[PDB]
Amino acid sequence: MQNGDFQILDYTGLISTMPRVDTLLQSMNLFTEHFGRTTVARIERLDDGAGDIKAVQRGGVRQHLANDRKKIVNLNIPFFPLDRSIDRADIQNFREFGTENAPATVDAEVQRHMARIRRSHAILKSKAMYAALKGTSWSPDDPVSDYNYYDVWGATQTTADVDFTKLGVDPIEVLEAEARAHIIDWAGDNGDNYEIVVLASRQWFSALIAHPQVTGAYSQYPSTQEILRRRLGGNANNRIFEHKNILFIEDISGNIPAGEAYIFPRGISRMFEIYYAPSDTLRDANQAAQELYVFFKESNYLREAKIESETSFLTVNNRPELVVKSTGKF
Amino acid sequence: PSDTLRDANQAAQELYVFFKESNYLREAKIESETSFLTVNNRPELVVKSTGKF
Amino acid sequence: QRGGVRQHLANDRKKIVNLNIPFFPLDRSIDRADIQNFREFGTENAPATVDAEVQ
């Protein structure tokens, strides 16, 4: 590498940095994938139950039953494009920024753009699931869908608030009573022992552990999962805790508002779904959709290169009833 | 080099000639390109003369 | 919205720095007089040897 006009120097190395991308929700595998053909989907509901029988005199009048109930809904899907171009001036006289004298190559910039586009698509997909879990679809600046599942299906948001400043009150005694009772009374089918999971912001999860009740619970004899001397979840970035037949997870991504936590059960059928629609191309029109489409074009006149990527999907929550907005006070 | 994406920093040539015939079979194009500079390294060694008439 | 207009991506970042290096010398010599008549310390009678100081 060249130093001032009459001097030289030694090039040493390259340092690169990039922000973290979270994949916890992807890892948990809570969403089922459906590849459709159109941009409209249907969902069928069929709810049934029973009534009570009242006593009547013998030999006189009789009693009659009611009938069932049905509902049908429809939904649309948004679109997400992403494009970029490359010009001569970007590589005309710019050193590669790698080795000492290698000239800039179009391929390197193409790979950089590929990486950036992939990262952006992954981030968008991550944000979509977080938005869906909250009970609303993700479609910024696109009021065409803006579907609020609580309003669409008809429901209300259970709170199950908890206060941590009361050292003499175990917070779990409110979570159990409210959340688990509501979930059991609203499972809809006839099940048992549903597993409960909780997503907590850093502040909420950190405050929960420090509560005197939990510490006193495990302090006096070893048991297992030694909170005091080990670390929750080992050395992994995402801490894990399990107390009173519940699983607690910390949200590193920070998408959850600070101090808030969402409680939902596992195992329930078809609570979460995601649908993919085809792109705006003759090859894929009316065909089976794919996760992501990437295109690349080199100008036949040697004076341009362009990159193209697009995708279209929707995240749907089929049961707003089983999401509880835990809110902490400190 | 020429102002083209495939040789923006590759090397130089005396004279570039590009011939393109439209993909729709209705027009054709011819382009030429060349960039250079002539250098006189020793101006001290050239004498300029003028005279009356 | 589908069939309308598209969006584009942003640019990149770069930085460079430069640094110098120091220098650290160390020297020492040895002479005849230092071992001509002296006796190896810690030994009864062995005469002084040149290598025993170089080491």
- Do the beta carbons of residue A205 and residue A248 sit within 8 Å? yes
Question: How many Å lie between the alpha carbon of A251 and the closest alpha carbon of chain C?
Answer: 28
Q: Which of A104, A300, A305 sits opposite B9 (nearest CB)?
A: A104
- Do the beta carbons of residue C9 and residue A113 sit within 8 Å? yes
The half-sphere exposure of A211 on its side-chain side, counting CA atoms within 13 A, is 23
Q: Which of C9, C12, C18 sits opposite A117 (nearest CB)?
A: C9
Verify whether the Cβ–Cβ distance A280 to C6 is below 8 Å: no
E strands, chain A, in order: 32-35, 40-47, 69-76, 80-86, 162-163, 196-200, 240-242, 247-250, 260-265, 272-276, 293-298, 305-311, 313-317, 324-329
What b/e string do you get for A224-254 counting C-beta neighbours within 10 Å, with b at 16 or more?
Answer: eeebeeeebeeeeeebebebeebebbbbebe
Residues of chain C that touch chain A, judged by Cβ-Cβ distance less than 8 Å: 1-3, 6-9, 12, 14, 18
Verify whether the Cβ–Cβ distance C14 to A142 is below 8 Å: no
Verify whether the Cβ–Cβ distance A280 to C7 is below 8 Å: no
Which residues are registered as beta bridge partners of A295? A308
Verify whether the Cβ–Cβ distance C7 to A117 is below 8 Å: no
Chains in touch with C (≥3 Cβ pairs < 8 A): A
Residues 6+ apart with CB under 8 A from B18: A302, B29, B30, B31, B32, B33
Q: Which of A10, A30, A101 shows the shortest CA–CA distance to A323? A: A30
Compute CA distances C26 → A133, A292, C21, C23, whole Å. Answer: 69, 65, 17, 10
Residues 6+ apart with CB under 8 A from B42: none
Asked how this structure was determined, the answer is cryo-EM
Query: Which positions in chain B touch A106 (Cβ < 8 Å)?
Result: 5
What b/e string do you get for A186-218 counting C-beta neighbours within 10 Å, with b at 16 or more?
Answer: ebeeeeeeeebebbbbebbbebbeebeebeeee
Verify whether the Cβ–Cβ distance A304 to B5 is below 8 Å: yes
Q: Which of C3, C9, C18 sits opposite A84 (nearest CB)?
A: C9
Whole-angstrom distance, CA of residue A69 vs CA of residue B43: 101
Query: Which positions in chain C touch A95 (Cβ < 8 Å)?
Result: none
Residues of chain B that touch chain A, judged by Cβ-Cβ distance less than 8 Å: 3-6, 8-10, 18, 20, 23
Whole-angstrom distance, CA of residue A192 vs CA of residue A183: 11
Whole-angstrom distance, CA of residue A174 vs CA of residue A246: 13
Query: Which positions in chain C touch A120 (Cβ < 8 Å)?
Result: 9
User: β-strands B16-21, A324-329: how paired?
Assistant: unpaired
Whole-angstrom distance, CA of residue A272 vs CA of residue A132: 9
Residues 6+ apart with CB under 8 A from A279: A289, A293, A310, A311, A312
A59's tokens: 């030999």
- Do the beta carbons of residue A229 and residue A301 sit within 8 Å? no
Contact exists between C and A (3 or more beta carbon pairs < 8 Å): yes
Taking phi over 0 as left and psi of -120 to 50 as alpha, with beta for the rest, A234 belongs to left
Resolution in angstroms comes to 3.6
Whole-angstrom distance, CA of residue A326 vs CA of residue A303: 57
Verify whether the Cβ–Cβ distance C6 to A83 is below 8 Å: yes
Please report how the helices A202-210 and A212-219 are oriented relative to each other, as an axis angle in degrees rounded to 10. 50
How many Cβ atoms are within 10 Å of A113's Cβ, its own excluded?
Answer: 21
Contact exists between B and C (3 or more beta carbon pairs < 8 Å): no
The length of chain A is 330
Q: Which of A125, A83, A120, A109 shows the shortest CA–CA distance to A310? A: A83
Verify whether the Cβ–Cβ distance A299 to B5 is below 8 Å: yes
- Do the beta carbons of residue B5 and residue A304 sit within 8 Å? yes
- How many cross-chain Cβ pairs, A to C, lie less than 8 Å apart? 29
